[PDB]
Amino acid sequence: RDGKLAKPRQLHNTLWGMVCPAETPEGHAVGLVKNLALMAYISVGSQPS
Amino acid sequence: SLKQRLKGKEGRVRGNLMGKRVDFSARTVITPDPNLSIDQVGVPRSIAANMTFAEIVTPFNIDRLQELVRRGNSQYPGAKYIIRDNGDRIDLRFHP
């Protein structure tokens, strides 16, 4: 939405270990739909006080 | 309103003139069969139990056409509906 016109997705180097590369739908939503790796923790937020 | 129904945004153009629905059709799942001929297409038994075809009654084969009418609508080799000359569309299922 916020940014278009000639902006492909393809594959990025930071996807290693964080997002499963071989897990995407076969329809028109390929590449746009992301997932999560097997062993990965999501940050929840903390106070750096 | 009145313009949207005819402009083309799913109105009387794209949704009717450029995209309507017809009758007498079938759409299943294709399966490979090299043993058949180049024109022998697959026809299911459940689909054939509904696809009808209005055939005129000719005196050259009036005996064969009468056999399908006498048997009724109880099996495949039979007739379902009939149409007379004036327009009488008589059914054979609930016929006395």
Partner: protein
């Protein structure tokens, strides 16, 4: 007389096309199905698609092909004057 000009000079080769073969086989099959006198001699068949096909090879179908020209005129053609292509 101001439009039909088939009795003077004809430009199209006298040969039946694939479009005219479909209409002749379709129109004749509808007439025979409505109890019509058979032009040829019947040998024992009831298929309306086969009766019109047998009469096409015998060139005995009394029909005249009226090919409308795009300029406004039209030309006439007969069954004997058109050789079928298979």
């Amino acid at each position: 007389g101001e439009r039909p000009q088939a009795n003077q000079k004809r430009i199209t080769t006298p040969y039946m096309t694939k479009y005219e073969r479909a209409r002749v086989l379709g129109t004749r099959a509808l007439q025979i199905a409505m109890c019509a006198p058979v032009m040829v001699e019947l040998e024992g068949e009831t298929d309306p698609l086969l009766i019109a096909m047998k009469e096409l090879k015998a060139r005995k179908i009394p029909i005249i092909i009226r090919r409308y020209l795009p300029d406004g005129s039209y030309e006439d053609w007969g069954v004997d004057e058109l050789i079928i292509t298979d």
